[PDB]
Ligand binder design. Structure first.
Ligand SMILES: Clc1ccc(C2(c3ccc(-c4ncnc5[nH]cnc45)cc3)CCNCC2)cc1
Lengths: 337, 20
C-alpha cells in the first residue's frame, strides 16, 4: 500500500541522509555540451559522461557566489537531499563533486525542456493536460513530505519534461528537512503562501498552496496573483480574493478554493486526512494514481526528440568558461559537500 | 482581458526566486 511504500522509501532515504555520498566523480570525466539555463550563483549544462556515453544535466555552482548570496546552508541542503532521494518525478544526483572554484551536481537529463516554455508558448493547458502534471506533483510532495522535506519553489520554470512527457521537479536550492516550523523568507513571489509573506513560522502547507498556484497557472495560462512589482503581488496574495476564468470547471474551482486557502485549518493537504483530501477530490476522479506513478498513462504532450543530447527544447544562453582557480575557495564552508 | 493584462506585464518571462 501507500503507507507501506512510503515506510520502505523512508528507510532508503534515511540511510543515505545519514551517510551522504561524496566526491563520486571529477570534471574531466564529462564533456560539456551546452548551457541549458542559468541562475544567480550558477548554471545547468548538458554534459556527456565519457565512460558510458550517458548524457546528464550538470549543475555548476560558483562557491564564492553562493557565499556572497548567503546560500551556503541551502546549497548543502540541496546536495544532501538530492543524493538521498529516489522518485520517478525527481532527479536524484547520479554524481557530485567539487574543485577549487565550483560545486557540481550531476542528474538525469530531461530533454523535453521546461514546462514554462511550453506553457507560455501554447498559452494554457487543458484541464486533463494540467491534471496529468498536477498528479505527478501531488505524488512527489506526498513522497517528499513523508521524508520531512519541504520543497518551497514550485513553479513551471522548475518542472522539466522528459522524453515520455512526464515531469521532473528540479532545483532543490530551497528544499529543507525540518520536522517543526521554519521561517526563511524564500520562494518565488507569485507562488508564496500568505504565511511566508506575513513572516510567520510555516510548514509543508506552503507546498500545497504552491500547487494551487501551479494548477491555476497551467489551466488559465496566467497565475492567480500577478502585477508588475512583487509588492503588488504580495498585496493580492494576502487579501483573500482570487478570480477564476469562466472556462474553469466547477470541480477545478472547488479544488483551487481549497488549495488557495489562507486558513491553514481548512487548506487541503494540511488537514487530518492529509494528501487524500487532494487525491480523492472530484477533479482527480479520473486519475489512476498508481498508473501515473508507474508511468503507464499516455502523456497528453510528448516532446520533439530528434536524438540523444538534443537541446532544441531549451533556449540558447551565452556559453562561458568553467574556470578552476589554482587556489581552493571556501574550503571550510563546503567541507561536507 | 486578464490574458492581455498578463502578456503586457513584465512578469511573463522566467521568474527569479526571492530570499532574505
Ligand atoms: Cl543555478 C541554476 C541554473 C539553472 C536553473 C534552471 C534549470 C535549467 C535546467 C535544468 C535541467 N534541465 C534538464 N535536465 C535536468 N535535470 C536536472 N535538472 C535539469 C534544471 C534547472 C531552473 C529552471 N529555469 C531554467 C534554469 C536553476 C538554477
Amino acid at each position: 500500500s501507500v503507507k507501506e511504500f512510503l515506510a520502505k522509501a523512508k528507510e532508503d532515504f534515511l540511510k543515505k541522509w545519514e551517510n551522504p555520498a561524496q566526491n563520486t566523480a571529477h570534471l574531466d570525466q564529462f564533456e560539456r555540451i551546452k548551457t541549458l539555463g542559468t541562475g544567480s550563483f550558477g548554471r545547468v549544462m548538458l554534459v556527456k559522461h565519457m565512460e558510458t556515453g550517458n548524457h546528464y544535466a550538470m549543475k555548476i555552482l560558483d562557491k564564492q557566489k553562493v557565499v556572497k548570496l548567503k546560500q551556503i546552508e541551502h546549497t548543502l541542503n540541496e546536495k544532501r537531499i538530492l543524493q538521498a532521494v529516489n522518485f520517478p518525478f525527481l532527479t536524484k544526483l547520479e554524481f557530485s563533486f567539487k574543485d577549487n572554484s565550483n560545486l557540481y551536481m550531476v542528474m538525469e537529463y530531461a530533454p523535453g525542456g521546461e514546462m514554462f516554455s511550453h506553457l507560455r508558448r501554447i498559452g494554457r493547458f487543458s484541464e486533463p493536460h494540467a491534471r496529468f502534471y498536477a498528479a505527478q506533483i501531488v505524488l512527489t510532495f506526498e513522497y517528499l513530505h513523508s521524508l520531512d522535506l519541504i520543497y518551497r519553489d514550485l513553479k513551471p520554470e522548475n518542472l522539466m519534461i522528459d522524453q515520455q512527457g512526464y515531469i521532473k521537479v528540479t532545483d532543490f536550492g530551497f528544499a529543507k528537512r525540518v520536522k517543526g516550523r521554519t521561517w526563511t523568507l524564500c520562494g518565488t513571489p507569485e507562488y508564496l503562501a500568505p504565511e511566508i509573506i506575513l513572516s510567520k513560522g510555516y510548514n509543508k502547507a506552503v507546498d500545497w498552496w504552491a500547487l494551487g498556484v501551479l494548477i491555476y497557472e497551467m489551466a488559465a495560462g496566467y497565475p492567480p496573483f500577478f502585477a508588475d512589482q512583487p509588492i503588488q503581488i504580495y498585496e493580492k496574495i494576502v487579501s483573500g480574493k482570487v478570480r477564476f476564468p469562466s472556462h474553469f470547471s466547477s470541480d477545478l474551482k472547488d479544488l483551487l478554493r481549497n488549495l488557495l486557502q489562507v486558513d491553514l485549518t481548512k487548506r487541503f493537504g494540511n488537514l487530518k486526512n492529509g494528501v487524500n483530501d487532494i487525491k480523492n477530490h472530484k477533479w482527480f476522479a479520473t486519475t489512476d494514481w498508481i498508473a501515473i506513478y508507474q508511468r503507464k498513462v499516455e502523456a497528453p504532450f510528448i516532446p520533439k526528440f530528434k536524438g540523444p543530447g538534443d537541446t532544441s527544447n531549451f533556449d540558447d544562453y551565452e556559453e562561458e568558461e568553467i574556470r578552476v582557480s589554482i587556489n581552493e575557495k571556501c574550503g571550510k564552508e563546503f567541507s561536507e559537500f | 482581458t486578464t490574458y492581455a493584462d498578463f502578456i503586457a506585464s513584465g512578469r511573463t518571462g522566467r521568474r527569479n526566486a526571492i530570499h532574505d
